[model samples]
Target: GPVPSRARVYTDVNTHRPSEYWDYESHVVEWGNQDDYQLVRKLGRGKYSEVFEAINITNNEKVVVKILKPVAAAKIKREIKILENLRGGPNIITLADIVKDPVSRTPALVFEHVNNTDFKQLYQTLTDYDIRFYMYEILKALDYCHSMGIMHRDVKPHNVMIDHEHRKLRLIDWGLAEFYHPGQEYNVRVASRYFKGPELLVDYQMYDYSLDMWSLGCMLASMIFRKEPFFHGHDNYDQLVRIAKVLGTEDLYDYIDKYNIELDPRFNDILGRHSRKRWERFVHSENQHLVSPEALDFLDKLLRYDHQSRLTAREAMEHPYFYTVVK
Candidate 1:
């Protein structure tokens, strides 16, 4: 209905690269020997894949094997190509090999394993410094990938693998990630429900790398507020309502009006007008230790109703909230 907006930065990355780089469908996979890897135990399962802790017999190294479930061939190819393209980016997951069973023809991805504690348990024990340090680490990964023309699309605590003892972090799950092209309409169904941005809930498709920043802000808010998920929405429609309840319905209306976005009829019933809630309201005895003026200021900038107003990953890394961590 209106002109599409481009990313504030790195808008021409894909355009500068050779056609072969982003043309994932044309890339053929070089399958590795499945016999070289052995599954030890099941780690987790996702809509598209089953994960396992596995051993690489070649050098007796531990790794993660993500068995790809049946899906479109193009989707599988895109993930492999994106992983290959982003290899060695800061804190990005390292893909060790791509393997498949000869008899079953089932594909799997091998990744360098990080000894991670479950986030539910791990977040409980993290000190203020630990939160800042790890959040900064993930920002490095986000900035690097965005600079390389990739939107993680899925930035959440579950996807961020942290080895606390080693002070190491690696972002996992590139299956939902996509290369960003300026003004291109992307799929709205990307990030998890609790972390989904306003742009996604409103069905705005011409989004860019800034989409990941909103998700990161949600992650940060939940961490400092001591809420597992600060925005607890029962469903997609409720998700936006949850956000509007905090950020206020007025700004939500302003954001849509600015972009000429029409509200879906479903929202008319549930979307009652809400005034903006201040960030300070979330501070309490349990979370006061983690909450600071700088943290609040940083969170405010990232959780804007307008995507254009949200901080870019690069800019977010420089915010004063990370002064000590960056130093």
Candidate 2:
């Protein structure tokens, strides 16, 4: 077991709130009438739910319908509770209603529809200013969530919906998010592999909101470097190896030592010493336009091995890189 590490900011947020506020298992969901919405077409499918572009028949307005797959009742309630608690927060997805089928009893969540372009295509066309502006918006959402004692464990391009033309950004997919409690051990198997933080890869269960900052760093790195996944790892163990290659094995050792983390025996066979690569080395002709001193500096603060060292969401928004956008 590693030494206990708490979130630098907002450590006592949950302690101050009533137990009912953070206890999703005991929360009773009030199901809405499913007939009010009509599914128009399939949007996409994930491991947990099937998403569709839908219409609110009552008002003939566009909306998103996420039909929940057969999953644990606790999980479904958790997501609904989080959305309800964070409703109306800056850049947070607005959950319109929750409904269930009469016959099958399958549950669904309704959300305000956003006109989003696929990130794969959108990132290719974004100017440096656009990236800065949208990133700041995302920080606002993250700061708001952190302030309320929740962490959006999954923070990646796929979860961020962007309507570039309208300069709108919404942080979606709170299924993986959880309320933060001080000194609690969390599952390392939270964020996606490409965006996983070093603490997750090393099995440091006492992580906090800083986990989201690391994922944000990985997202920013990929966008600036023009690499779809800045850290390419084949598996969970390989993920740490990939990070070490860029951030150096020595720093990894120092981080593990600071936290009193024990390396998994499996790592002995595959792990090797590596020197940290300079951020400038990743800048290339195609991505040169996106690369700037402030951008690199901002990335450097987030991609650190020590979770506590990563910038808090509010701190990230105030970074020099966002000075122009903030004004």
Candidate 3:
């Protein structure tokens, strides 16, 4: 952690966010310390930047190099801004060094080289201990970020990276992240669909850190059930239907009306929904005791339809789900 890591800041929202989440890191990077470091291969592209594996000839150290696309400059700015504002927290990924393009003046983000696939892959082979440990770390990271007004809006397995050999799990990717003041209404920018809390998908301007909690619930459910996500779809309607089915709640309209949120009339066609099965039954069948009662309690708080009742990250961290059971 650096001196600036003490405060969490998000100057990245200053401005092209992204053309595709597909380009791994960026188009190029300035060679490191005597040009000894070289690009090896593209790891994966993110919402805002492309990540790659690079090798250091100086010491043969392999690291992940994150570079921003020209189109995603705004998103790059947001990631850098939020990261720049962030201070010391083991749960947060470390921004080791920055690279400046000598010609274009574009910046490249350098990060510690964690050796292993992201949790998206690990979920396939994760034991009970692995799941608990992973969730524990994620909750801790979410808690730390929320304390300083930053929210990692994107809390999917793809964003959860680990150093398997080192048994290290740190949260990564701040492209969709945002900063908010206490009691301030947040502008839920996009239709999150999968990770979205009720207010986020409904286009609520005023929001809170609890949005992350909603995503956490989805993440936990996906991991435990080995299901992709409760509500999985590109469009919001499809996503909401997916949610309504699992919840089997006929109150989306009632909930929205109670919150005074005017839904697009067509939303009426999508609301008051229900699926053939319920979340409770699905979980029990997937993993008899993998989901503790408290875990369900936390998820209930997290996935509420009203944005006003959103669960804050700190509250989830305090829930016994994380600490009561030793992972």
Give TM-scores for every candidate, taking all chains together and pairing residue i with residue i: 0.98, 0.98, 0.79
What is the clash tally of candidate 2?
0
**Model number with the top lDDT:** 2
Give the Å shift of residue 246 in candidate 2: 0.5
Report clashes for each candidate as comma-separated counts.
0, 0, 23
- Model 3 ranges off by over 4 Å: 1-36, 57-59, 72-74, 102-105, 118-121, 182-192, 248-251, 272-278, 284-286, 323-327
The lDDT, on a scale of 0 to 1, for candidate 2 is 0.93
Query: What tens-digit string does per-residue lDDT give for candidate 3 at 1-327?
Result: 101111122223222134222232443322445255588998888555677898766678887777766755556656765675564585788766667645335667777677766555677777666777777788788877765556787777767887766778888877777665444555666425688776666665556566677788888787667677667865776676777776655556666666577666776765565643545776756575466677667667767765446556656557776675465
Writing each residue's lDDT as its tens digit, candidate 1 over 201-265 gives 99999999899999999999999999979899999999999999999999999999999999899
CA lDDT scores, all candidates in order: 0.91, 0.93, 0.65
lDDT of 2 by residue, 239-263 (tens): 8898999999999999999999999
Error of 2 at 88 (Å): 0.2
